[PDB]
Design a protein around this ligand. Sequence first.
Ligand SMILES: [Zn+2]
Length: 257
Amino acid sequence: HWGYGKHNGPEHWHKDFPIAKGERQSPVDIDTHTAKYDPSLKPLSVSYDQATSLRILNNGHSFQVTFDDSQDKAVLKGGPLDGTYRLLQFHFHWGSLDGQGSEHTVDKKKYAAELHLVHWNTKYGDVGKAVQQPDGLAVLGIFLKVGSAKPGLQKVVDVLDSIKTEGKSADFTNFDPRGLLPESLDYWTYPGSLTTPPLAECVTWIVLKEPISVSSEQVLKFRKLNFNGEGEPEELMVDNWRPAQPLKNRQIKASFK
Ligand SMILES: [Zn+2]
């Protein structure tokens, strides 16, 4: 099975998922001087007030918080998007040290972690159908740097003890994802892919320019999770990030000058 180790990591994934060498793979380096300000880009609309979180789960490659996506409760609209995208889950990528962990980079700079809020286009009816469409998903990416604590993250951090190993889940209701967002919704956008297998090329990426700050104690909690299941040799869930992929025939657009 795929993972992030020497023998099953990102350099291996193309064997089971040949699209790994495709024309619109993610993540990418965001060269801030080459990204073009697009005045026609609209402001992002993040409507999370009615979000209904359900569970938190260790899926063996990250931990994710899942939401009720059976109605338009928490949706992403506007920005570069046509139509309405429902929030399904969020998860993180992080490092073993504070100088690595993000998937996207900014002028080659790596952040300590990266939050992905995953939304799917409601015109395709279900997320399984959406991942087979070039505009099926919209992922909101938010960088994490280490500094001051993020109060809105603490509820997540405090439950990680209970989902240490692959396959464990817990109730995680009434979690408000608005508490994870930075002040500014200024963003970069480009067409890409899932950054985990099956690496489907169905994602409009929206990467916020402003990172959030989390504390060292908070990120330390991430690094105590485990890739392995209960009872197997302990392998810390760290460095669960895919490196930057070739930009190829793509332009990154900026909503801001
Ligand atoms: Zn991700």
